[PDB]
Design an enzyme around this catalytic site. Structure first.
Site, PDB file in Angstrom:
ATOM      1  N   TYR A  23       0.875  -1.250   0.062  1.00 49.26           N
ATOM      2  CA  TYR A  23      -0.118   0.029   0.048  1.00 49.26           C
ATOM      3  C   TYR A  23       0.708   1.311   0.088  1.00 49.26           C
ATOM      4  CZ  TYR A  23      -4.507  -2.582  -0.173  1.00 49.26           C
ATOM      5  OH  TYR A  23      -5.543  -3.307  -0.492  1.00 49.26           O
ATOM      6  N   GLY A  43      -1.090   2.280  -6.554  1.00 51.53           N
ATOM      7  CA  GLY A  43      -1.776   1.297  -6.949  1.00 51.53           C
ATOM      8  C   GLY A  43      -2.021   0.107  -5.867  1.00 51.53           C
ATOM      9  N   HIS A  58      -4.697   5.665   5.168  1.00 52.88           N
ATOM     10  CA  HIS A  58      -4.684   6.809   4.458  1.00 52.88           C
ATOM     11  C   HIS A  58      -5.203   6.917   3.222  1.00 52.88           C
ATOM     12  CE1 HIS A  58      -2.203  10.415   2.523  1.00 52.88           C
ATOM     13  NE2 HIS A  58      -2.641  10.904   3.509  1.00 52.88           N
ATOM     14  N   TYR A  64      -8.467   9.504   2.124  1.00 44.34           N
ATOM     15  CA  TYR A  64      -8.484  10.296   0.887  1.00 44.34           C
ATOM     16  C   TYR A  64      -9.718   9.796   0.008  1.00 44.34           C
ATOM     17  CZ  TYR A  64      -3.881  12.890   1.152  1.00 44.34           C
ATOM     18  OH  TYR A  64      -2.843  13.557   1.382  1.00 44.34           O
ATOM     19  N   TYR A  79      -2.762  23.364   2.583  1.00 46.67           N
ATOM     20  CA  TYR A  79      -2.996  23.673   3.694  1.00 46.67           C
ATOM     21  C   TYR A  79      -2.052  24.006   4.517  1.00 46.67           C
ATOM     22  CZ  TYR A  79      -1.906  18.846   5.241  1.00 46.67           C
ATOM     23  OH  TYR A  79      -0.965  17.834   5.565  1.00 46.67           O
ATOM     24  N   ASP A 117      -3.726  13.352   6.969  1.00 49.33           N
ATOM     25  CA  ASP A 117      -2.219  13.195   6.795  1.00 49.33           C
ATOM     26  C   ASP A 117      -1.596  13.169   8.120  1.00 49.33           C
ATOM     27  OD1 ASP A 117      -2.549  13.591   4.182  1.00 49.33           O
ATOM     28  OD2 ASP A 117      -1.878  15.793   4.119  1.00 49.33           O
TER      29      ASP A 117
END
Lengths: 122, 122
Positions: A27, A31, A47, A51, A64, A89
């Site tokens: 991960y 992909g 994560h 997203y 940000y 994040d």
């Protein structure tokens, strides 16, 4: 955005994300599929899921601000999207740090072909 | 991608990009307009132009690899898009480094309202 994410990983773990967290397991990289190989890899899975749960935002590109209070990451006060992206994040960076203790170089460059297992659902 | 770009700026200048190159002048930040205030700002203008010349690519999100040979950034051998994106980023990082000597904190947080001048063309 990914700019902030890279700096956040470096600041929280002490490790260059490009050499430690860009081609690791199933991960941590492009992909992702199959099942996470270890705790660090599962940080990347989670994560990705975080997203994916923000289709009304642009997590990779929306800049940000963040800072630190008492050593800890504090997300800036931005748009709802910026706040949500930053929290994804932050969670990931802290997850990497907490799992440094089981990080294993043997999972660097792990081949995608060995991740062809039914992909875990978020 | 912006992940690599941030690490490249840090490695080349020694400065955190989020505190030095994210809200500076008219171009280092979101929504660049008007004319660059100084050399550092013009690095950002030129980088924006470089990304704008790649409509067939995804410069902010397409990951790539780079390394160093004799201290210098060397882009990895990737797709045509990855190669082009990496070269934009490399050029910018080296531009920031070369212009550290005229960096001025006074242009940090420069208001966009004072950049409402006919925007320079690429």
């Amino acid at each position: 955005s990914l700019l902030e994410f890279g700096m956040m990983i470096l600041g929280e773990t002490g490790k260059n994300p490009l050499t430690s967290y860009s081609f690791y397991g199933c991960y941590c990289g492009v992909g992702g599929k199959g099942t996470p190989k270890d705790a660090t890899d599962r940080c990347c899975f989670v994560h990705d899921c975080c997203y994916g749960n923000l289709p009304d935002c642009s997590p990779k590109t929306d800049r940000y601000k963040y800072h630190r209070e008492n050593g800890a990451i504090v997300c800036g006060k931005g748009t709802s999207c910026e706040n949500r992206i930053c929290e994804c994040d932050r969670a990931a960076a802290i997850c990497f740090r907490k799992n440094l203790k089981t990080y294993n170089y043997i999972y660097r460059n792990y081949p995608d072909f060995l991740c062809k297992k039914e992909s875990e659902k978020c």
